[PDB]
Amino acid sequence: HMSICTSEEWQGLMQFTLPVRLCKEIELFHFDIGPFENMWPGIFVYMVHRSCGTSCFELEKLCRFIMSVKKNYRRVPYHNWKHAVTVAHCMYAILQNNHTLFTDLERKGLLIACLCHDLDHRGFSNSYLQKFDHPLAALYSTSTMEQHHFSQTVSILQLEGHNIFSTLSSSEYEQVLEIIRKAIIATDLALYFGNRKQLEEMYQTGSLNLNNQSHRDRVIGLMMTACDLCSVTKLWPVTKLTANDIYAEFWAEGDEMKKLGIQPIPMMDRDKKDEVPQGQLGFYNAVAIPCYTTLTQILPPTEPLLKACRDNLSQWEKVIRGEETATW
Ligand SMILES: COc1cc2nnc3n[nH]c(C)c3c2cc1OC
Ligand SMILES: [Mg+2]
Ligand SMILES: [Zn+2]
């Protein structure tokens, strides 16, 4: 089954008011939610209301959905509740800077898909679950975890007083759930590589057309990747601290593989930390920089994500040259 929020939890969220100083900061792509843990459910409510209006959801149902989503994220080093809210905030900023390019239905579906995209993550990759024939790999052949995250999202909506979409007409309901399903599967990085090459060719040739549903799905797919990886778009100390959380989870998986008699890939090996600055360089060159370059060409208002990603690539290159200061 699914874990449920207490009455105190969602009632506490209903009376949450955001500090006026934060209303300005939240609009910016570089916004770091890190220092405001007590306000994270409240920041999501504010985002929903700012993106889709104050009445888009029955306030009571929205607060219950949010606090139960929080309760079904695990205490893992990276794929946790903090990650969900960070990903949802990047989607908010993208949607605010390109608001009428997207319909009300898409905005509702995308913000909720971002909050739910890693629901019940156990801190183990698709490679681990496949390699060690976990039941999840038998149920879901490809994009194993992502198909499980969506399955988890539908289950929360299926709880009493949690279906925030039950008031949509029969047709827009099916439409929103499909927007959500496609958004969550798109967060499987395996699919990103093909998605970005298909989008780049459509852009360079001028065939890219947002009124074409297949094109719309791919653009939303790239937006999902862009949000999922947005830790590489923050101010350098935030980017570096999240990288510590990301590697703490990879090293725990690698530790599990060594217990099983299998040498992990160097990236998951805590005895190979000297290889991290070069691995980040490879990740930015092959994954991050291309993602934001393509997203920027399609949606010019997202240029700050690209700019910030280029600045963080410079910082990683400074680490390799032994020019870094600070720490902590
Ligand atoms: C900050 O560097 C990284 C960020 C990441 N974020 N999400 C990820 N999902 N799956 C993978 C493999 C991710 C990943 C990898 C990174 O370096 C290798
Ligand atoms: Mg994921
Ligand atoms: Zn994620």
From Swiss-Prot:
3',5'-cyclic AMP binds at H79, Q280. It comes from Homo sapiens. The active site is at H79. A divalent metal cation 2 binds at D118. Disulfide bonds: none annotated. Abundant in the putamen and caudate nucleus regions of brain and testis, moderately expressed in the thyroid gland, pituitary gland, thalamus and cerebellum. It is found in: Cytoplasm, Cytosol. This is cAMP and cAMP-inhibited cGMP 3',5'-cyclic phosphodiesterase 10A. Belongs to the cyclic nucleotide phosphodiesterase family.
